[PDB]
Every structure is written in structure tokens, then in C-alpha cells.
Design a protein around this motif. Structure first.
Motif, PDB file in Angstrom:
ATOM      1  N   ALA A 139       0.830  -1.205   0.000  1.00  0.00           N
ATOM      2  CA  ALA A 139       0.000   0.000   0.000  1.00  0.00           C
ATOM      3  C   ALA A 139       0.868   1.260   0.000  1.00  0.00           C
ATOM      4  O   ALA A 139       2.016   1.202   0.422  1.00  0.00           O
ATOM      5  N   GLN A 140       0.332   2.388  -0.516  1.00  0.00           N
ATOM      6  CA  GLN A 140       1.026   3.678  -0.462  1.00  0.00           C
ATOM      7  C   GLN A 140       0.361   4.560   0.592  1.00  0.00           C
ATOM      8  O   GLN A 140      -0.840   4.464   0.805  1.00  0.00           O
ATOM      9  N   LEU A 141       1.157   5.407   1.253  1.00  0.00           N
ATOM     10  CA  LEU A 141       0.677   6.213   2.365  1.00  0.00           C
ATOM     11  C   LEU A 141       0.502   7.663   1.909  1.00  0.00           C
ATOM     12  O   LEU A 141       1.389   8.210   1.250  1.00  0.00           O
ATOM     13  N   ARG A 142      -0.627   8.293   2.278  1.00  0.00           N
ATOM     14  CA  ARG A 142      -0.769   9.730   2.084  1.00  0.00           C
ATOM     15  C   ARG A 142       0.330  10.455   2.857  1.00  0.00           C
ATOM     16  O   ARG A 142       1.225  11.032   2.247  1.00  0.00           O
ATOM     17  N   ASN A 143       0.272  10.407   4.192  1.00  0.00           N
ATOM     18  CA  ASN A 143       1.249  11.104   5.008  1.00  0.00           C
ATOM     19  C   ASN A 143       2.548  10.291   5.057  1.00  0.00           C
ATOM     20  O   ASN A 143       2.581   9.208   5.632  1.00  0.00           O
ATOM     21  N   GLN A 144       3.618  10.844   4.466  1.00  0.00           N
ATOM     22  CA  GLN A 144       4.940  10.232   4.439  1.00  0.00           C
ATOM     23  C   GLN A 144       5.622  10.260   5.808  1.00  0.00           C
ATOM     24  O   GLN A 144       6.692   9.683   5.971  1.00  0.00           O
ATOM     25  N   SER A 145       5.024  10.924   6.800  1.00  0.00           N
ATOM     26  CA  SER A 145       5.520  10.835   8.169  1.00  0.00           C
ATOM     27  C   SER A 145       4.947   9.605   8.885  1.00  0.00           C
ATOM     28  O   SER A 145       5.317   9.310  10.011  1.00  0.00           O
ATOM     29  N   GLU A 146       3.975   8.935   8.264  1.00  0.00           N
ATOM     30  CA  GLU A 146       3.478   7.667   8.763  1.00  0.00           C
ATOM     31  C   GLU A 146       4.364   6.518   8.234  1.00  0.00           C
ATOM     32  O   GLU A 146       4.389   5.451   8.831  1.00  0.00           O
ATOM     33  N   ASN A 147       5.125   6.753   7.152  1.00  0.00           N
ATOM     34  CA  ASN A 147       5.934   5.755   6.463  1.00  0.00           C
ATOM     35  C   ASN A 147       7.196   5.422   7.269  1.00  0.00           C
ATOM     36  O   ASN A 147       7.712   6.273   8.000  1.00  0.00           O
ATOM     37  N   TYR A 148       7.729   4.204   7.064  1.00  0.00           N
ATOM     38  CA  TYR A 148       8.826   3.679   7.870  1.00  0.00           C
ATOM     39  C   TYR A 148      10.130   4.409   7.599  1.00  0.00           C
ATOM     40  O   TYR A 148      10.487   4.730   6.452  1.00  0.00           O
ATOM     41  N   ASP A 149      10.888   4.575   8.682  1.00  0.00           N
ATOM     42  CA  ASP A 149      12.267   5.023   8.588  1.00  0.00           C
ATOM     43  C   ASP A 149      13.204   3.831   8.638  1.00  0.00           C
ATOM     44  O   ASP A 149      14.244   3.859   7.959  1.00  0.00           O
ATOM     45  N   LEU A 150      12.849   2.865   9.509  1.00  0.00           N
ATOM     46  CA  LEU A 150      13.574   1.614   9.702  1.00  0.00           C
ATOM     47  C   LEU A 150      12.571   0.464   9.613  1.00  0.00           C
ATOM     48  O   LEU A 150      11.398   0.616   9.979  1.00  0.00           O
ATOM     49  N   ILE A 151      13.021  -0.660   9.028  1.00  0.00           N
ATOM     50  CA  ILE A 151      12.216  -1.872   9.031  1.00  0.00           C
ATOM     51  C   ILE A 151      13.113  -3.081   9.365  1.00  0.00           C
ATOM     52  O   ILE A 151      14.236  -3.198   8.857  1.00  0.00           O
ATOM     53  N   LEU A 152      12.605  -3.952  10.267  1.00  0.00           N
ATOM     54  CA  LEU A 152      13.261  -5.169  10.724  1.00  0.00           C
ATOM     55  C   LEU A 152      12.790  -6.358   9.890  1.00  0.00           C
ATOM     56  O   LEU A 152      11.605  -6.673   9.842  1.00  0.00           O
ATOM     57  N   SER A 153      13.734  -6.989   9.200  1.00  0.00           N
ATOM     58  CA  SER A 153      13.405  -8.144   8.382  1.00  0.00           C
ATOM     59  C   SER A 153      14.652  -9.035   8.301  1.00  0.00           C
ATOM     60  O   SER A 153      15.522  -9.011   9.181  1.00  0.00           O
ATOM     61  N   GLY A 154      14.763  -9.786   7.208  1.00  0.00           N
ATOM     62  CA  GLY A 154      15.887 -10.683   7.012  1.00  0.00           C
ATOM     63  C   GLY A 154      15.788 -11.294   5.625  1.00  0.00           C
ATOM     64  O   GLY A 154      14.845 -10.992   4.890  1.00  0.00           O
ATOM     65  N   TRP A 155      16.779 -12.113   5.282  1.00  0.00           N
ATOM     66  CA  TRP A 155      16.794 -12.802   4.006  1.00  0.00           C
ATOM     67  C   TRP A 155      17.342 -14.216   4.194  1.00  0.00           C
ATOM     68  O   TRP A 155      18.109 -14.465   5.122  1.00  0.00           O
ATOM     69  N   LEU A 156      16.937 -15.125   3.296  1.00  0.00           N
ATOM     70  CA  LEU A 156      17.454 -16.484   3.252  1.00  0.00           C
ATOM     71  C   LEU A 156      17.510 -16.940   1.798  1.00  0.00           C
ATOM     72  O   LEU A 156      16.930 -16.295   0.926  1.00  0.00           O
TER      73      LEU A 156
END
Length: 513
Positions: A395-412
């Protein structure tokens, strides 16, 4: 003799025991073990691969199928066309009970796989391999769109299993191709006797196997329980091997008579924090560097994983053959004083998103997120933690201050090749796909990566992945956190246990003393 294995797969640990591939992975090596392909050669232009196939190889003789010919090039052509998407009735992956003769499906089924299971889709095998043809009954030609020395890596992975074209024809003619994945026919050292979905698979030795015969005749894969339940069964001797146990419960659950050992292998996986370069403040290198320095990754690793993981100071996992270029130190590791000096003044308020899923690279992502939040608090940064699903990331966010600065994930990944590990998460080509959470695009990095697949020379691939990695560790589009070991427990009476870096094991080498 019989063995019961309580498995985490509940990775298909079953499909590796009943199917062979063209090649197998040998640990820490770029050299592939010839399996159904006994040898190969690559053309001068790097765009054509010749596979010489093994003779005398039989498919399983089962209640549902009697083969009239040996494995040959038609099985390879059929199998590789299926995994390039080209079989229109069958899912690209062996599943069971899912088939496409349906209007509002395949478009839906493949879209949800791609959102939910992005590992396979990140391969883009149909953008790399142009065609597969039989030149003779025991030789196959693979034609590439462009040179790519990572392509064989994929033909040694779990997705590149070899099915029976003869079985699939007998089924089509009796319009019953749904039974390909329900009643399997393979060349592997075990064959399926029977099963109950979500409960158990019973395997029985293949008495006509082309390589070393399996030592234990009967194996039951128990799927019927949860993670804690596997140890409860293990210690009540309802299974003699239990994978991915919850190690913090061993002390509570063990009985003081059982002789058992723990075995572990380095895994091809990484837990990381990604920075969103769609956020202008995150594009500031001094802020990225300082955030990395706030985090006591050592303490995080110890608290979250209880000595089943290692601090990742590199992007390439130690188990890769490419890990010869790894160095043990990380420039932006824990330095809380320098982090505070740089950051406290800015009065940052950051959004940290956490993908709500269970993956082997992180058993407790929300707990880890609280510890990250705390460390950033000590440097004078306030963090709001938010749980998000992968659909929500589309999804896309109207307010870009609601959008993530950091996201916790990983890869395999399912092979050792850096190409399919770093390209999906950090390349310009994936910047608008879900695998590149950083929304990062560095052209110099893509050039090192593109370079590494133009050549088959080992020391040359290594040199390119060394440049690519040093660049990523300098620019910090992501902060590496952990590489997580694969773990099982087995009865002391069981030997020949060899856990792969992808969470599987070879059932055919197990034996009782």
C-alpha cells in the motif's frame, strides 16, 4: 528398523529425500556435486550449457506408477519447463492439492506466493533461461538470455527437482495431472508409502537407487505438532530426531536417562535492519552510521537467540563459499557515546516497522524491536514500533511521516551463491519490489554484482563480491544483525546426521549404532 523425525517443515525436508536434482551443493564450495547430471560444459559466449545425464537411473515403482524407461532428457526438459512457469496446469513449485483449471486462480495463487513467499520469485529463472532442449536422450542444452555464472547454483537447489515426464503423460491422458504432486514419483533414495496431510509422511527405502542405498528402511516424518511439542515427543521417545527445537525448554523437558546430542550448522540467512531512502533524513550517512553505533548487537543476539546465532558483521553468510572475502570487524558497531553525541541534538522521532512473520532468521522480531528501541532511546532517538504485514507494504501512504524510517526483516536462500542473496535485497532492479526494503539504488554496487555473474572464475567472482560487500558495509543501506544456525537434537544411538545450511538433512546416511 524405523526412525521417526519430528520436523519444522510442518523448506520441504520430504522432497529432498524422494527427488534428486541435476547437482547437489557441497558445503563451503562453489563446486557442485554431479548428481543426475554427471558432467557439464559452458559455451565460449557463456550462453549455452551442455548437461550430460547419468545412465541407468530409475524412477520409483509405486502402487500408482510403473515406469517403462530410465530417467532421461525428457524428464529434465519437462521439469525445468515446469519451474520456468511453462506448465499451465501445474504450479511452478510442487505443492499438493492445488491445480490450475480455474478462472480466478494462478493469477491469485502466484501473486500471494510472491507477496507471501518472495524467495522463489526473487530467482526470476524465466528471465535468465531462454530454453531447455534435449539434444539426445542423455544430453540437455540450456540456453541463457545472457551469461550468468550463478545459474547452476539454482539447478542444485530445492526448486530444481526432477519429475517423471512419463508419469506426467500417463496422468495427462487420464486427465489427472493433479496426482503428480499428491502421489510422487522420484529417483531419490526414498519413495512415499502413504501420508495424512498435516499429520505424517511415511517413506520407504527405494531398493533400486542409483547411488549409495539408504541404511534405514522405514522413516516417518511427523508433522503433527508445534515447536514446543517436538521436544515433548522427543523426550518421550516418539521421535529420535527433532529439528528446530525451542532450546530454552530443553532443561525443563529433558529426562535424566535419555542420551541425546544437539547438532548445529551455519545457515544461509541474515536478520537485518533496513533504512528507507525514501526518507530524506535516512539518506544522511551520518545518521545511518550513528544509528548503527547505538545498537549493542552482541547483547541483542544473546538475548534473542540463546547461543544459536552469530553476530553478522558481513552481508555474505559465513557458510557461503564467498565468505573467504569476509573480515571479522564492522566499522559501525556498538559505540554508544559517539552515537549519542551525533543524534541526541536532532530530537529524531523514527518509525520502526516490523514484519509480523516467523522466519528462521528471527524467532522473536517484536522482542528484538523493543531492544533496538531501548538502545536508540539511550542515544536520544524516540522510536515507534509498528507491526505490518507484507500486503500492507504494497500500500502507499498519504502522510509520508506515517511511512517507515527503519524496518526489521531478514533474508534467506536455498544455495550458497551471493548473487541470489544480495541482488534481491539491494539492487536497482528490485528497488520497487518488496525484497529491497531500503528502496536503495547504487549503480556502482549493481556493476560489481553484474560483473560477478559474467565470469565462472572463482577468484574473480570473489573479488567482485568483495567490492560489492565493502561498499554495502560503508554506505549502510542495511545494518546486518545475525546469521542463525540450523539446529536439531538426536538420540545418541543415531548417527550419520548431517544438517544442511538450508535446514534439511540427508535421511539416506542416517543409521542406528
Amino acid at each position: 528398523n524405523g526412525l521417526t523425525y519430528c520436523t519444522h517443515a510442518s523448506m520441504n525436508v520430504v522432497t529432498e529425500q524422494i527427488y534428486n536434482k541435476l547437482f547437489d551443493i557441497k558445503n563451503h564450495s562453489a563446486t557442485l556435486t554431479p548428481m543426475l547430471a554427471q558432467s557439464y560444459s559452458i559455451s565460449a559466449d557463456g550462453k549455452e550449457i551442455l548437461l550430460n545425464l547419468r545412465h541407468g537411473v530409475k524412477f520409483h515403482q509405486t502402487p500408482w506408477f510403473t515406469p517403462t524407461r530410465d530417467f532421461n532428457a525428457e524428464d529434465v526438459v519437462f521439469s525445468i519447463n515446469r519451474v520456468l512457469g511453462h506448465n499451465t496446469y501445474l504450479p511452478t513449485l510442487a505443492e499438493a492439492n492445488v491445480t490450475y483449471s480455474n478462472p480466478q486462480y494462478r493469477v491469485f495463487h502466484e501473486q500471494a506466493r510472491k507477496v507471501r513467499f518472495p524467495y522463489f520469485d526473487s530467482i526470476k529463472l524465466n528471465e535468465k533461461i531462454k530454453s531447455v532442449t534435449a539434444l539426445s536422450p542423455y544430453q540437455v542444452k540450456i540456453e541463457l538470455f545472457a551469461p550468468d555464472s550463478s545459474i547452476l547454483s539454482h539447478l542444485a537447489s530445492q526448486y530444481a527437482i526432477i519429475f517423471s515426464q512419463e508419469y506426467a503423460y500417463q496422468l495427462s491422458a487420464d486427465d489427472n495431472l493433479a496426482q503428480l504432486d499428491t502421489h510422487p514419483v522420484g529417483t531419490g533414495p526414498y519413495q512415499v508409502k502413504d501420508y495424512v496431510y498435516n499429520q505424517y509422511v511415511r517413506l520407504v527405502r527405494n531398493e533400486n537407487y542409483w547411488k549409495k542405498e539408504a541404511k534405514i528402511e522405514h522413516i516417518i516424518v511427523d508433522l503433527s505438532t508445534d515447536r514446543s511439542g517436538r521436544l515433548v515427543k522427543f523426550f518421550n521417545n516418539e521421535c529420535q530426531i527433532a529439528s528446530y527445537p525451542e532450546v530454552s525448554q530443553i532443561g525443563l523437558l529433558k529426562n535424566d536417562d535419555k542420551h541425546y546430542y544437539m547438532q548445529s550448522t551455519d545457515g544461509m540467512n541474515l536478520a537485518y535492519l533496513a533504512f528507507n531512502f525514501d526518507k530524506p533524513l535516512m539518506r544522511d550517512h551520518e545518521i545511518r552510521a550513528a544509528i548503527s553505533q547505538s545498537l549493542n548487537r552482541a547483547r541483542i543476539i544473546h538475548s534473542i537467540y540463546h547461543n544459536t546465532a552469530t553476530v553478522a558483521n558481513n552481508i555474505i553468510p559465513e557458510v557461503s563459499w564467498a565468505s573467504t572475502v569476509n573480515t571479522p570487524e564492522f566499522e559501525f558497531d556498538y559505540h554508544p557515546k559517539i552515537a549519542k553525541n551525533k543524534l541526541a541534538d536532532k530530537n529524531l522521532l523514527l518509525n520502526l516497522w516490523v514484519i509480523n512473520e516467523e522466519q528462521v532468521y528471527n524467532p522473536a522480531p517484536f522482542k528484538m524491536a523493543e531492544m533496538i528501541k531501548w538502545d536508540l532511546a539511550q542515544a536520544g532517538v524516540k522510536v515507534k514500533v509498528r507491526a505490518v504485514t507484507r500486503p500492507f507494504l504494497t500500500a502507499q501512504l498519504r502522510n509520508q511521516s506515517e511511512n517507515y524510517d527503519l524496518i526489521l526483516s531478514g533474508w534467506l536462500a536455498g544455495n550458497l551463491d551471493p548473487d541470489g542473496f544480495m541482488r534481491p535485497i539491494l539492487s536497482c532492479g528490485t528497488k520497487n519490489e518488496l525484497t529491497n526494503l531500503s528502496n536503495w539504488c547504487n549503480e556502482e554496487f549493481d556493476q560489481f554484482m553484474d560483473r560477478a555473474i559474467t565470469t565462472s572464475h572463482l577468484s574473480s567472482r570473489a573479488k567482485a563480491y568483495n567490492e560489492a560487500q565493502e561498499l554495502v558495509l560503508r554506505e549502510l543501506p542495511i545494518i546486518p544483525i545475525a546469521n542463525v544456525k540450523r539446529i536439531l537434537v538426536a538420540n545418541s544411538r543415531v548417527k550419520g546426521v548431517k544438517m544442511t545450511p538450508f535446514g534439511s538433512l540427508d535421511f539416506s546416511t542416517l543409521y542406528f549404532i
